[PDB]
Design a protein around this ligand. Sequence first.
Ligand SMILES: Cc1cc2nc3c(=O)[nH]c(=O)nc-3n(C[C@@H](O)[C@H](O)[C@@H](O)COP(=O)(O)OP(=O)(O)OC[C@H]3O[C@@H](n4cnc5c(N)ncnc54)[C@H](O)[C@@H]3O)c2cc1C
Length: 365
Amino acid sequence: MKILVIGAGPAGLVFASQLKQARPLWAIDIVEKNDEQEVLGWGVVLPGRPGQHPANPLSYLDAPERLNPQFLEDFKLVHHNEPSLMSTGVLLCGVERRGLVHALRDKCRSQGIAIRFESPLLEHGELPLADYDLVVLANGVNHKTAHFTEALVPQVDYGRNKYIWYGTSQLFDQMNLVFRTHGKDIFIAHAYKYSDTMSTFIVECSEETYARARLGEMSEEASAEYVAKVFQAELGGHGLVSQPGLGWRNFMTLSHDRCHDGKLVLLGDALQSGHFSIGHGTTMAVVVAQLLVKALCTEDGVPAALKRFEERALPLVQLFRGHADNSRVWFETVEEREFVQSFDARRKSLPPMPEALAQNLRYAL
Ligand SMILES: Cc1cc2nc3c(=O)[nH]c(=O)nc-3n(C[C@@H](O)[C@H](O)[C@@H](O)COP(=O)(O)OP(=O)(O)OC[C@H]3O[C@@H](n4cnc5c(N)ncnc54)[C@H](O)[C@@H]3O)c2cc1C
């Protein structure tokens, strides 16, 4: 069989490797838009301990300890200049995005999966459909501007508040979202350590706040220090550094009510993206990728496999979407608000994620 994967990110890679390992003879190639050492983002939080949790991408590496994963067991919430509590959750590990993506790429190559960098695919006329049995679209949020077919156009929902992905030397040994009211403005930060020297610092605020502080009409370094000053209490004396490709923006939720179209199948953020306020994007990429692999190893043809894939994928992506919206909305509406109670039940009466992921995991694996 011949499979083409557009996108060398978590979803694309986890699928490639998973499938190659099970079907070595199958031909699997990947095309990446960017260069080899061009990965965006700082650090991400993942479920469980590498090697012990099937949902974590680090569990598919020959040596995950190499990336120096940071294990976080506690959660600190600062509200009104006071740590409401340290309600510990479950076991989550943080690790560098770049490092993760690079490792997964080395793994695919060591398995015989070719990856052609700096080879973006945008136009539908660029799809060598007649030369492949399956085309996997795992090109992240770029899918929005490159959907290849009207029948695969996203829903696209722009988050109400602005956010930016900062990186910092301040070590947050324990996860903690902070609410700092600086003047008439409300700033929210999501921080956690992902390495021995770096922490992720996701900051967000309303459009009004973004306009008052002129975070956009200001210099990248100038905005950072400004935000760094508002949180100097939490960051100690450490500043904030942004990436040339992140910057300020509104979260785009790419939704779908269909998983495939002929030889094309969506995967990862390209299929469904969800606000980062629940940290499941990479987990979703991994679980859904496994669903496609099982379907391909059990069904006779591609069409037959896609159909069976559809069955369990959609129900899962809708649930992820459901949780992503509740959490996102909750965060967008903080100004108009035991404060540690709402945040907890913000996911309403929706079935838990860790229960749904496992259900499909035991099935695909
Ligand atoms: C602020 C923020 C914080 C987040 N924090 C977390 C977190 O802590 N935990 C978590 O799990 N996730 C987090 N995410 C989520 C996020 O990382 C995604 O869910 C992502 O990992 C999905 O993986 P992917 O491989 O599907 O996408 P991507 O990483 O976007 O990969 C897409 C790939 O396609 C390539 N490319 C894109 N367009 C094209 C094109 N048209 N054709 C060819 N190649 C193309 C890109 O270079 C990239 O290699 C965060 C996101 C943001 C925005």
